[PDB]
Amino acid sequence: MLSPSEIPQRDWFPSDFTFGAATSAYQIEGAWNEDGKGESNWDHFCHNHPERILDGSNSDIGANSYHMYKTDVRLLKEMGMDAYRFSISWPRILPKGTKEGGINPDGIKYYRNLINLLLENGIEPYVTIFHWDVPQALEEKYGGFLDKSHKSIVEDYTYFAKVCFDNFGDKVKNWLTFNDPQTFTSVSYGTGVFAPGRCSPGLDCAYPTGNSLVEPYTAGHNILLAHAEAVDLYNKHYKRDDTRIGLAFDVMGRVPYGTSFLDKQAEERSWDINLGWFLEPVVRGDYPFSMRSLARERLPFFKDEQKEKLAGSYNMLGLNYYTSRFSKNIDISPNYSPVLNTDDAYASQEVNGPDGKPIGPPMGNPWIYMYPEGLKDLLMIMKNKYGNPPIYITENGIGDVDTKETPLPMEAALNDYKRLDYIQRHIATLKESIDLGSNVQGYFAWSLLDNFEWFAGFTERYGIVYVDRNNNCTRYMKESAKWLKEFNTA
């Protein structure tokens, strides 16, 4: 849909800029109980109540990347990708979650083999330590990130990070402690659509015996205390001049719904609760003012020693960006009371503006609307407000819908011109943002592979490479992957 002169070229970007693709462990690996790996929260979730995954599926196999990793690397290599973002499975390294439980030599060997193979193919590993797959042994012991002591999860996570640094840090120069913290907390413990599926009594989820106005914030502050300890560890013993550590935030761009100053206020509260929640702690050592004023006692306080450790705890940062929303003011009044942690923004997040028209063209699935300007907005915030740190777009993509009711022919799934156009426009926005002074240094397409998309299961294909599950998870390059190959190698 873009004109030939508006199509991004690789020479639009500095030679040290990084293009890559991304996955996560639970979503692609399979081999859930093989070679000494312990159960995760998502394993027990999918399997004690398969009715809570939309299509009744799980990731026992996924894309079978534990066995098929050589082909993943082959595909990355063919496409000329500079880098690959994958995560390490906590229960695969440490089946009981703990130093007690001991290190699983086969887990270590897997990621060691993946890493060496990527590097010998000139592909830089960007390693996410944790992508939502908490060892089930830790969930039963103390609730995982719901840990009320705010110490046990912190120590256990830190030791896991230690193991990763100790076994992979010679070769891995780019670490991310967490990925998508706002989605993990808000969806797992707020709406409870994600494992372990907890929400306030009354709401529709597997375990409605939590608190959607509190538990997301509890899990969130444990995440922050854990990243701060791991970075503290990393800086003391493992940081070298050419290595970097950070974390990756999910963020939906925010635009004022109408012309009123109230909606500008709503917009700012929405950036704050989505981006600011986890960003502002790692930048300055505390949550956004707005969240503290609105969540109040539901948002725990950091101790002074914790603030020091948190502030400046990154060398780089990731942004996971898919879409944007219009933010519309809600007043404080006796006519309104927050139900979900995200309602503490006092702003409704609308797809359609005042003219009835969507913010951008719909990309196929329930929630992605194409709005590359919001990516630009986000980058200008990071630039002008939060010190312009080194930024990677660690996720960007769309999901093609493919279900029993409405199956997607393989020819149409491979002819993914919607995805291709979406990717091109967003890469073009990075060009525009760099020119404006953004310190963005790379871009990762979300989903190297069609994979298990959490609640959506296999109903959404986010891959630039198709995975044929009817066969033996055979990979086929889509048009998007073919364009990326041309782009990277020209």
Ligand SMILES: COc1ccc2c(c1)O[C@@H](O[C@@H]1O[C@H](CO)[C@@H](O)[C@H](O)[C@H]1O)C(=O)N2O
């Ligand atoms: C049930 O539908 C929803 C509701 C809310 C969210 C999502 C789906 O997607 C969430 O998380 C993304 O999922 C992909 C993989 O599934 C991750 O790789 C990506 O990093 C996540 O952002 C999300 O955006 N929701 O809050």
